[PDB]
Amino acid sequence: TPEKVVNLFTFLAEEVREILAGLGFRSLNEVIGRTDLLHQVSRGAEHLDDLDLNPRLAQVDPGENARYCTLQGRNEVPDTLDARIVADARPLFEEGEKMQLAYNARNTQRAIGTRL
Amino acid sequence: FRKSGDRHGWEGGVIHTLQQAVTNDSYTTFKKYSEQVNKRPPMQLRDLLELRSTKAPVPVDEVESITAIRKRFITPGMSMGALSPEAHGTLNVAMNRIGAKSDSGEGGEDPARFRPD
């Protein structure tokens, strides 16, 4: 039943909310990348291994730009001639009539006629 | 036209070449037609003139597209009376197909042709 998944996700959300509350911070956008909050402990006084996760615990100090996606919206791509094609074929979108076009192409026009 | 007469704008070979070039859909035949037209003695004033440029020849793949130039030509007015409905209708649809503008000509037009089929 979908309500099962509903309650599952709600319980997980409440748990992470309480965990971050007890941790001290106020929002998730401030703990992402602050990897100095983790520490390595041992398994016990019987295994006697030397596992060192330090080759992960290091990080690079970013500086100006943040440690998350600060840029909403996708990174657009340069458009080919097909955009200009749309600007010419208005009657096909406003009345529904045939059209016959012609152009001079080069090998630098990627994926022509897709947006149409 | 008469063989004993002087020059004329529309001869016979000219028309046959044009019609065959249009039907066969081959640009080489149209080039042949244009050469057959330009190689006649002067008949109009514009023929006396000649182009001349001082720039350098450029590759033909940098100038405007075919449609960007076809959007300039039109077909002047033709009366519905002195024509048959078939010819004027075909001209009208053929001009509207590529985006250029046709004409109506004096004599009105059938209102039933206001919406596409």
Q: Which residues contact A103 (CB under 8 A, 6 or more apart)?
A: A81, A85, B65, B66, B67
From CA B44, how far away is CA A12, in angstroms rounded?
A: 90
Neighbours of A82 (CB within 10 A): 16
From CA B32, how far away is CA A2, in angstroms rounded?
A: 75
Q: SS3 for A56?
A: helix
- Decide if B97 and A88 are in contact by the 8 Å CB cutoff: no
Helices (H), chain B: 12-24, 27-38, 45-48, 66-70, 85-98
- Decide if A88 and B99 are in contact by the 8 Å CB cutoff: yes
- Decide if B116 and A103 are in contact by the 8 Å CB cutoff: no
Q: SS3 for B14?
A: helix
From CA A11, how far away is CA B26, in angstroms rounded?
A: 74
Which method resolved this structure? cryo-EM
From CA B37, how far away is CA B16, in angstroms rounded?
A: 12
Q: SS3 for B101?
A: strand
B 37-66: CB under 8 A from A:
61, 65-66
**CB under 8 Å, gap of 24 or more: what pairs does A45-51 form?**
none
Q: Please tell me what resolution, in angstroms, this structure has.
A: 4.1
Q: Is the dihedral of CA A38, A43, A48, A51 positive or negative?
A: negative
- Decide if B61 and A95 are in contact by the 8 Å CB cutoff: no
- Nearest chain A residue to B115 by CA distance is A95
